[PDB]
Amino acid sequence: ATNRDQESSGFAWWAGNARLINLSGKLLGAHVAHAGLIVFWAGAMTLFELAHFIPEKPMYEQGLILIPHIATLGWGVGPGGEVVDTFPFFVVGVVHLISSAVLGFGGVYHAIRGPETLEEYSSFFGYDWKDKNKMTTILGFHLIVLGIGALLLVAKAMFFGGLYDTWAPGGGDVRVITNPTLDPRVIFGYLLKSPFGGEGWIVSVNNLEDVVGGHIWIGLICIAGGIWHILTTPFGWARRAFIWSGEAYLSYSLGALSMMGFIATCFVWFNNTVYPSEFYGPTGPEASQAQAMTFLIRDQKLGANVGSAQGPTGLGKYLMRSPTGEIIFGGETMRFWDFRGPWLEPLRGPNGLDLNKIKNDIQPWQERRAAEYMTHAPLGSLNSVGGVATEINSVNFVSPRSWLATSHFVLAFFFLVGHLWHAGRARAAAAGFEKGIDRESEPVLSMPSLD
Amino acid sequence: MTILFQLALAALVILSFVMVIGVPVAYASPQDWDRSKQLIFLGSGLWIALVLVVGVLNFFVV
Amino acid sequence: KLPEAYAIFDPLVDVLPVIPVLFLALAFVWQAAVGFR
Amino acid sequence: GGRIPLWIVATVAGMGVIVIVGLFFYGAYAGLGSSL
């Protein structure tokens, strides 16, 4: 047992995986076995979802988060998101589950049977954390792997059936993307959009041409960057700015993943393009807008002139102006006027919601969709009682958007904590005081008094 | 083929359960490792073969 | 539903997603067996 | 004296706790208290 106690390793059992920092062979096993766990869950959870799946209920009424991801890629679904064939869901689940056995095999092998360190065995696979060029080379390999992944999405969208497009003319449908947006002014313009209301940074992407074109750019950027880091070594200014240690690199990635988790939380909460509402349920803004639409339709059918109806406050009961003049739904949903969705856009003209279209052109399918979304708003209890907090038991519902947003905020937050933990520790360890102050060389004792 | 399918898939589950326990025990056992290594080779190949059999037979029972 | 041929394994499919959680608990069984050294 | 290893006692006891608490969560969805 090399390094597997606190006396030899310096680390207690509850920090036991820190015993692996300089054991590249066992550390490879831990990483590969962990990848097996991720892939295991994806496959097993998909098969569980499929076994529990009733195809004539909406996905979002059934606690599904993975089948919605597969369907967004255009597999298994047709017009309006209706399930036409569950076999692709089955294939995705089985192939992941089978693959996790392979990963688990290599992980267990490297972790307890293979060489504990790789450097004696292979200069190619061995590494020193402090070897800066070896680190950028492995980083480069992985950037190329990621770039290929981004191009697999592009290939699916352009040559292997397309993607599910909630915005397709005539109704949502799977659509092949033939003209991805390549203009860098458009693609990188998303990156310079404000994250505040009515702008929404990259979360505002609202068409598949921009999505696919963005992944073309990301694919080439990652492959170029990967080749760059295979061929170069960190410049002097970079060398002086960073801590170069295994724990420091981990802390950098933890900060990156925390940021990505916060971004994914906002993506699933606001975006209804790459998270189609057909699969994930309406967004919070969407359902609130749909309520206003529902009672506008009802009261107008009863004879109300919804354009001139003054509410109790003096604002329009159904329709009012945004702070820049656009005609928007009234009531508390005034806050949600940046919402855009395919059931509502036919009623929008140049100045916002158009009264003549409201009076004459609302179709039954729009009334249906608004009623559906208003009554599947992403509100519900931890034990999955759907509705407001005061609602009685009856409806078993929590929106997938709430499950995905809450889980990823929690994970993003703890990964920010982990970043601070390991970044501060990597700094202290590199400088040599992570185990405490040297009694014979206490820095504050050599400093002048503050007063 | 259904009898061949139900037999191949039940064998795959059983063998998987045997590999799941036996591989880590063999990897961490000092004694009789040469007999273990060949068994693990054999189990692994048989495992891969059963996956392909179930995958093919899938399309003749559905 | 799974394809009908696989229906016999429905009880197994119901349990599989939790197996990763068991790996975390296994680490504690293992550490207990070596005295948390 | 010490014939049964402590790690087995802890593992079996802990599994028993999981079973009983699991039963209690099952009962939240069935019979009394289930809202049904």
């Binding site: - | 880590p24 961490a28 056992s29 004694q31 | 197994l12 119901d14 349990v15 069984v29 067996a33 | 790690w7």
Partner: peptide, 28 residues
């Protein structure tokens, strides 16, 4: 309905590995 049986065999596999290795003085 049979689900409990599966969880028992799956749930024992982990501790059984540790027990088999402890019995044979393996490399725990």
């Amino acid at each position: 309905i049979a689900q409990l049986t599966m969880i028992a065999m799956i749930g024992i596999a982990g501790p059984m590995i540790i027990f088999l290795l402890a019995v044979r003085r393996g490399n725990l």
